[PDB]
Design a protein that fits this description.
The structure is cut from a larger assembly and holds 3 copies of chain A. Chain A is built from no helices and 40 strands. By secondary structure, chain A is an all-beta fold. Bound molecules: calcium ion (3 copies). The site of one calcium ion has 6 residues of chain C, from strand 41. Chains A, B, C: Keywords: Calcium, Glycosidase, Hydrolase, Metal-binding.
């Protein structure tokens, strides 16, 4: 069988792969999207399904007010002593001389279970990872941040013993490794294999310069020798490769005695007839997860097929297990549980923000704050996972002020989004309008040419057609006949590469929202949500 | 004798003056500074003292993660039916096409008591104010925000009945007034006096273009006719006047049948030999509160002495009552209660952040997040209230990493501050260092020329000398002999006028903090805090 | 009758008014536009006509390569000893800590005669002016530039005797006046009237803060006393006045013993429902010339009708004399003299750039450099002189590459313009296209939708309709039926107030050009040029 990369499409960065007997799991980072930490499962490493988000209660994860691309950075998922261990990081400051954050540990018998109250770790840097050694000792490793303005911020990798008995870090923390001249040394994981401790790190930063390198030591404290052939993984030198930004990896040893390496990538939109070294590309699907096969040479791991990483990869010798889709293309909102592929921003949804119970067969969003708010938005959304797809919904809404709007939205962060809305105007009553924000530049391109909605229309149908480099919205008053709204958007503008600011770590979403600035919590009822990839 | 403006110095904007029998109060806005809403008291309108901050627990005010210059905007303090009524606004979004915010009402029989849990009002704009009519009815007025990108955002003034019985706004909301051509129409207050309802509004924005205008109507919902002589109050046309930005006013009728108008102002640093129309000034003391005498002509109020506002103002006919200072110039941290002049950022202090109990005679700050964090800083500060002063402290601190730092800080917001710190270096051990941020540009100007601290020094004394246009830090190991540190700072860079971004609404502070990025909560012990104006 | 301001419409700044017996003249600045210095004539001060541009040969004026808004700044025209004297300034550096410039004197018996080769003066500042005293002595006054970065650049007014006999400045130069606290002291002119030397200066800068102030002395050297009522002229304090930016004035004493004051102004486009103090306006007609009546009070001049400047002004007691228009609404290019309302950029036109002698009834432009070049553009243009007008042309052109284009253009400077062009495309052949530049942001909004021109079309008609806040281009293949190009432009973007950079001193023009990058000098024949105001 063949692995066809990427294995986890759309926004799914920083893969932490972990084996539990013959089950395989990957944890990916979720940043401001709630509930936190995606966990996907596989039997064969080829086919994956989404199965859990452990961080689903305020006591585990409180991101109210968190900056864009703050919150959950690279997660670390392990399996030891018969249970799963999750190290996660809440990032509070995403730019400037500091990166204030807090690391925590939680555990659970199963990935989809009720995770334990969190244990407080440290905050010396992000990318915390829990290593379970073969002598029963446990160690936390993370990057150590140097805020000093005349120094590179990535001071190296710190190691400190973790005591499960005391439920805290113990002993002295030590810097064990400083990285290579590529720098941005982060993503540490340790593996004790045969004669060595192997320290895997990401380097170069999570852009086109991304890489993974491996160092080794006979003792856990180092010093570590660097692979003479470093990096292990990178496509920096090959701008034509389908998989770019190859780094932030983690290693798995299969029950079939084979070796695979999960890592993030970006897949740029077509760059066209433009300088291939200069214009490396825009990635609206964010950072995704791929897996490479590893072979060993002179006691160093090496990527089969070359450092750049390959698209089609020989799968492990395991019977094929494909999964049915975890969502319906047309979700009629007939269940009381919101589909696992939907997230909301920063905080748990409550019945005062969203309800599937108020009116059977509908999702009712009670209007809250605007698309620019980092507090409470009545907004659920799912990832773009293809460059070509249709998404649609229909909504009943009776706004009586321009302070009320409900609609379909393509969204990256609070200053990068577009939306088609049902809202209201003094002279025309209920109308369809377009609103967008392009790195904090706001526009309403239709101006007075909004589209009036007849009083007798109950559900207004709204659709977006995403077609690689561009996308466009349409509406329908009968669910059959659609009309195009003349605002065409560039997909590249909902990409990690385009958005401004220190945090550019998520990806494009498509979703539905209800805004009510007045405080009246006006309800909008959505009859369905469609997502269909082409 | 005479009132000498400003009556409330340093950061004290948006004055809401309120009479209760023969006591007078002014509430001012506090934004991200906690506890919220400053209330000062006076018998005579001449002498004022700081007495309360009602919003002092999370159930009233939850500002964790709030943007700079979000949180508490203009407050509204009234006295009716034997108790005080405070309307306040928590602003969550301070820039862009929306200004997401939430208005609330709380009451108390005394300004310094335990205020009631907040009643939820609306969010259609800020500057909410509660008007008690003489027929038992009550109304809320506030600005109505228009987010549409092709429109000015200030749509006018909205009115809605408030029901004390039902604990909520009732009936329909109505736009009662659209303002003049100066626009930015906000700060609405209604006064029913004789035959008229008078509607006061601030206009022009809280910059050098600030003003106040009065309109009147026979009925509460208008139409309102505008004073032919508008504005009531403004120094926009007079760049040389000592008081600038004159606006956002409230009216009081004294028990001596006299009329006074509290309003905000800015007092620029000397502009020097520079064009007086172009460089209107930098105000490191933020917006302060002044009060003018009012006289009535043809049933319109008029500012005695001219629209620009005067520094010296005839006092009401009340026996003078002066107040003891509300702080000591040298605070020895000898009491279990932190001085009323100190605030912290956003959230309640807890014993895990700051303690006066852990080591009596010291304030112990347990290190938390950096100076750039909008979450939890172990940082207490007080307002600059003069252009010339000294402030100093001494600190006992044993950092073992550059991730730990404690010191004296002059601070405006998370991207505008400077500090002298006890911290640590690999080669020199404990050292004194300088850090600063100038509109998100960071620097550490001493570079390798940090100042080693001898192992035997227990408390390191730190001082800032503020001298109008500039300020500079010094240190001492003995408390007697000071050494200047060669980094000279510009006071104008800690001013409303200098700082970048949509929220520029506080003012300069000086205080003491402790940072510990590691997560070890390393304690710094501060023996005293001095503040002495020259 | 009444004078109706402005008397000189469109780009006509810095008026230097001059009486010669019973003729009145006003010179205005022309910056990079050639030939230099516009001179208008009048018998009555009510009716004006454009009659001369003295600086019409390279020996007088060499601006090849000059920065936008460099070249000819405020001119100074006087009449004395039977002839005209013109002081002019060629500014080579328009931004930064210096304003490198050179002042010159030329003379002529008539304004439309052949002016003498220039006498080199000084360079210590711009705004040079020649004062002829009644004792036969003559003096140059100009502003004196201070480049020091910590100082305001406007050091005051320098005075130095000029010797007609020696053809140079003689003796020592002296600073005679430092200006008021408004600063930007420039535009000095001295008038010896009765017992005083009156020194008039512009202050505040040529923005909405512009003004004129008068000071006086019994001796030419000062000290000068400043008018207690200063300024003499300004509308800074009155944002609603029709005439804004009132300053940079000159005084005339008529032969009827009356006093008038020529000055520049800006007339902003409608600002709409926007804060009147904040958005003072965009002026696409640049800075225009107005005239006020002067009365004397206590030996100080005073502006009749108030300092702000009036639109309607009592005329002097002189018979009214009206002038024929100086252009045909439809210019058929039948004369071999290019119409006086046409200028070109920087350099004299030669028969290799533009010729009326190549084909009778056509203006042939031989393609040169792009719209972005400060060197050689084959481009002639006339001022926008109303907010509402049609301009059009028809062009015969056979481009065979996208490197060749000819058409109609609205133009402010090299990085602010738009144009409709006849050009060429690989797939479609000859095409109509649109190109624009918006503060150095370039766009071609039609993209691949360039408009094919049929092979048999010999003249392509091109037109712009300017309609206050917007304008739009159209074309016709038969001169009868017109098609609109779907692109709408904002008139405010061709305004002094919108353009970036240190020099913002001209105004919008409309004209015709031919570009040929290949070096083939391909000819474009223009059959007519229409300009009709409405
Ligand atoms: Ca349904
Ligand atoms: Ca003490
Ligand atoms: Ca012709």
């Amino acid at each position: 069988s063949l692995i066809k990369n990427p294995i986890l499409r759309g926004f799914n960065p920083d893969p932490s792969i972990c084996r539990a007997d013959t089950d395989y799991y990957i944890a990916t980072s979720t940043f401001e999207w709630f509930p936190g930490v995606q966990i996907h499962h596989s039997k064969d490493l080829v086919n994956w399904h989404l199965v859990a988000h452990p961080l689903n209660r305020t006591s585990l994860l409180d991101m109210k007010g968190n900056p864009n691309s703050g919150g959950i950075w690279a997660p670390d998922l392990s399996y030891h002593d018969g249970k799963f261990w999750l190290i996660y990081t809440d990032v509070k400051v995403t730019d400037g001389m500091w990166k204030d954050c807090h690391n925590y540990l939680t555990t659970c018998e199963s990935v989809d279970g009720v995770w334990s109250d969190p244990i407080t770790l440290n905050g010396s840097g992000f990318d915390a990872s829990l290593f379970h050694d073969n002598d029963g000792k446990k160690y936390l490793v993370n990057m150590y941040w140097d805020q000093r303005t005349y120094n590179h911020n990535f001071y190296g990798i710190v190691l400190q013993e973790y005591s499960d008995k005391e439920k805290k870090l113990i002993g002295k923390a030590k810097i064990i490794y400083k990285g290579t001249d590529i720098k941005y040394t982060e993503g540490p994981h340790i593996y004790h294999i045969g004669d060595y401790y192997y320290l895997f790190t990401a380097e170069g930063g999570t852009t086109y310069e991304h890489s993974e390198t491996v160092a080794r030591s006979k003792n856990i404290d180092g010093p570590y020798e660097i692979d003479p052939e470093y990096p292990l993984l990178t496509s920096w030198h090959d701008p034509r490769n389908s998989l770019q930004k190859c780094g932030h990896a983690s290693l798995v040893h299969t029950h079939t005695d084979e070796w695979y390496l999960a890592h993030l990538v970006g897949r740029p939109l077509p760059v066209g007839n433009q300088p291939v070294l200069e214009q490396r590309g825009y990635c609206p699907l964010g950072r995704e997860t791929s897996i490479q096969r590893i072979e060993w040479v002179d006691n160093w791991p090496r990527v089969v097929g070359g450092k750049q990483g390959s698209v089609n990869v020989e799968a492990p010798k395991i019977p094929e297990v494909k999964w049915e889709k975890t969502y319906d293309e047309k979700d009629n909102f007939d269940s009381d549980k919101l589909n696992i592929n939907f997230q909301s921003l920063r905080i748990p949804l409550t019945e005062n923000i969203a309800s599937l119970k108020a009116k059977k067969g509908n999702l009712r969003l009670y209007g809250k704050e605007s698309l620019t708010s980092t507090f409470t938005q009545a907004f659920i959304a799912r990832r773009w996972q293809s460059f070509k797809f249709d998404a649609s919904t229909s909504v009943s809404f009776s706004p009586d002020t321009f302070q009320q709007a409900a609609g379909l939205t393509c969204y990256y962060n609070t200053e990068n989004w577009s939306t088609i809305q049902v809202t209201w105007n003094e002279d025309k009553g209920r109308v369809i309008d377009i609103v967008c924000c392009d790195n904090f530049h706001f526009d309403m391109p239709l101006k007075s040419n909004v589209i009036p909605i007849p009083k007798d229309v109950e559900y207004i149908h709204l659709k977006v057609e995403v077609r690689v480099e561009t996308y466009q919205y349409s509406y329908s008053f009968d669910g059959i006949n659609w009309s195009k709204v003349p605002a065409i958007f560039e997909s590249r503008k909902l990409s990690d590469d385009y958005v401004q600011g220190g945090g550019f770590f998520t990806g494009a979403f498509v979703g539905i929202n209800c805004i009510d600035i007045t405080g009246n919590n006006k309800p909008a009822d959505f009859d369905y949500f469609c997502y269909k990839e082409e």
